Every structure is written in C-alpha cells, then in structure tokens.
Amino acid sequence: ESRACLERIQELEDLLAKEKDNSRRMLTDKEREMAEIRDQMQQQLNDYEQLLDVKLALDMEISAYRKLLEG
Amino acid sequence: QKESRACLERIQELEDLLAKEKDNSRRMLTDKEREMAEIRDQMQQQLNDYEQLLDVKLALDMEISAYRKLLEGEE
C-alpha cells in the first residue's frame, strides 16, 4: 500500500483508540456525578423522614397537653 | 493522483467508526444528563415539601408553648 495511505490508516486507528478511551472516561465521570447526586437525594429524603418523626412526636405531645387541659 | 480501492475502503470504514463512537458517546452522556436533571428536579420538590412540613412543625412548637402557658398555675 502507499505510504500516505498507511499514515492515514494509522492516524485514524489512533484517533479511534483515543476516542474509545474518551468515552470510557466520560462515562466513568458521569456515573461518579450520578452517584453523588443520588446520595445527596437520599440524605434529603432522610431529613424529611426525620422531620416527619419530630412532627409526629409533637402531635403526641399536643395530645398529652390536651388531656391535661380538657380533663 | 489515485489511491487503492482497498485502502479507501479502509479509510472510510475507520472514519465511519470514529464518527459512530462520537455519536454513541454523545447519546450516553445525554441519557445521563437527562436522568440527572430529572433527579435535581425531585430534589427541588423534596426541598419545597421539607419547608412546608417545617412550617407545620414550627406551628406545633407555638401551640405547645401556648398550652404550657395556658395550663400554668400560680405561687
């Protein structure tokens, strides 16, 4: 084959290997971002469930106070 | 100036493979990105709810304060 053809084939083989490496890196990183945000969201869901519990415990305190007033 | 058919067939193949890799990559990134914006959206929701419920809580504390004062005896 001609020398100019071999160089172009070689160059494209490189760019394809380079590109497959870029895909692996960009995917790894976007999964890493994904795991950070889904954990952030889990912590938020937990803050809300803890707040719901504090709220539910005050409902019961309210009841005990009503029992003292309305008894 | 000519090149071989086999060579051209091989350059074109690689050029196609390279553009497809770029395509595959763009659309996997796009699917991540749309799933992340969908998630940052549920986090916006969850936070508005939290603030809403914090308000219920703050109002229960005021009611508790008022019952403690109302029941309070002298001396």
Whichever domain contains B70, its CATH number is: 1.20.5.170
Do residues B27 and A28 lie in contact, with contact meaning Cβ atoms separated by under 8 Å? no
Number of domains in chain B: 1
* Whole-number Å distance between alpha carbons of B36 and B30: 10
Q: Does B18 contact A12 at a Cβ distance shorter than 8 Å? A: yes
* Whole-number Å distance between alpha carbons of A17 and A25: 13
Do residues A19 and B21 lie in contact, with contact meaning Cβ atoms separated by under 8 Å? yes
* Whole-number Å distance between alpha carbons of A28 and B25: 12
**CA separation, residue B4 to residues A4, A37, A57, B72 (Å):** 11, 53, 82, 102
Do residues A13 and B14 lie in contact, with contact meaning Cβ atoms separated by under 8 Å? yes
Do residues A5 and B3 lie in contact, with contact meaning Cβ atoms separated by under 8 Å? yes
3-state secondary structure of B74: coil
* Whole-number Å distance between alpha carbons of B17 and B62: 68
Contact of A17 with chain B, judged by CB distance below 8 Å, is answered with: no
* Whole-number Å distance between alpha carbons of A1 and A71: 102
Chain B residues touching A45 at Cβ < 8 A: 46
Do residues A18 and B17 lie in contact, with contact meaning Cβ atoms separated by under 8 Å? no
**CA separation, residue A43 to residues A35, A36, A38, A46, B44 (Å):** 12, 11, 9, 5, 13
At how many Å resolution was this determined?
2.4
- DSSP readout, B4-56? -HHHHHHHHHHHHHHHHHHHHHHHHHHHHHHHHHHHHHHHHHHHHHHHHHHHH
Do residues B36 and A33 lie in contact, with contact meaning Cβ atoms separated by under 8 Å? yes
Chain B residues touching A12 at Cβ < 8 A: 11, 14-15, 18
* Whole-number Å distance between alpha carbons of B48 and A48: 11
* Whole-number Å distance between alpha carbons of A61 and B66: 13
* Whole-number Å distance between alpha carbons of B17 and A12: 9
In a mutational test of the A interface, the residue from B39, B44, B62 whose CB has the highest number of chain A CBs within 10 Å is B39
Domain membership of residue B49 as a residue range: 1-75
Within 42-71 of B, beta carbons closer than 8 Å to A belong to 42-43, 46-47, 49-50, 53-54, 56-57, 60-61, 63-64, 67-68, 70-71
Contact of B37 with chain A, judged by CB distance below 8 Å, is answered with: no
